[PDB]
């Protein structure tokens, strides 16, 4: 499958030197393919790390399915290997405000974990897990920021000590 | 006073163009004076940058001492002049864990917020406020961490609104 080695070559060289030091000659290297194959199969370089980060929403869209968000950062503390790669999702922050078709992009390549967490979210409610004197939406909103804060942290090398002891104080915050 | 001029300048520059595009040329035209000027005072971009930074840290070390980290997040929730800036602080994430000697830089320019909370903590543990069923540390990196996930949902442009709630559920999570 000449798109999957695209993708884990990519991954590889985004996560090694970052957006801007991912050349498209160094996107050869860690792939095995052409500049041709690669924009044959993605278009540019920006659809390339969007493909990335809609594999990251559909596996977490995976994990949250069964267990919620908290899980998700639960196996955040186990892939070390990972921070790198969150690194990059963060150095685009500048270009997600100043730039109208990448976010409108971005945001439809995080869709599927999207809609997951409010499926999970309304399942739990529907069940009576989750404390009923806030709101829903303030707990979903509440939950994307610790997980935004989870990667932020990690990304920027920061301890995982405590982060552990921090999810169990951030699901008795939501639950019943 | 001009290392303030600088400073001012440097901040907008940064804020409009990111990291990467505040050229020399540009940090000139920002701030109304010379290569020879900047980098007299603050040696390279990196330092200025870094200077920036400490400023950031020494006004929320002021906030969090009067009324902790929420009251640095409420102030961020009021202040969208300052989301273009909290961008570029998020871009260089990943030179935060390639690089020591920078990443040493940029945790000494944060200590004094780092102290801050410290104190502010020990102080309402001191009082009384702070639940004490969980280890103050863990409190702390709770806050830590939902703060660096406030900084990045407003950095990436994502909506203020029940931010407000989740504040009061963060202090309400905290609090006896
Ligand atoms: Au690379
Ligand atoms: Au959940
Ligand atoms: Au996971
Ligand atoms: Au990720
Ligand atoms: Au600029
Ligand atoms: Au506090
Ligand atoms: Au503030
Ligand atoms: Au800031």
Redesign the interface.
């Known amino acids: 499958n000449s798109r999957q080695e695209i993708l884990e070559g990519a991954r590889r060289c985004f996560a090694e030197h ?1 957006y ?1 030091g991912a050349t498209v000659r160094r996107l050869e290297e860690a792939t095995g393919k052409s500049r041709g194959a690669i924009f044959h199969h993605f278009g540019d370089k920006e659809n390339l790390f969007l493909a990335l980060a809609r594999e990251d929403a559909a596996r977490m869209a995976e994990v949250v399915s069964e267990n919620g968000l908290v899980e998700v950062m639960r196996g955040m503390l186990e892939d070390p290997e990972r ?2 790669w969150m ?2 999702r ?2 685009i ?2 270009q ?2 100043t730039d109208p078709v990448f ?1 409108a992009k971005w945001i439809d390549h995080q869709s599927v974990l999207d809609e997951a967490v409010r499926v999970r979210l309304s399942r739990n409610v529907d069940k009576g897990q989750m404390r009923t004197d ?2 829903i ?2 707990l979903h ?2 939950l ?10 990690l ?3 920061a301890s995982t000590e ?2 552990s ?2 999810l169990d ?2 699901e008795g ?1 939501v639950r019943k």
């Open positions: 970052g801007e921070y790198d690194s990059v963060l150095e922050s500048k997600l405000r976010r806030v709101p939406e303030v909103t509440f994307e920021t610790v997980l935004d804060g989870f990667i932020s942290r990304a920027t090398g405590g982060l002891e921090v104080l951030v915050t």
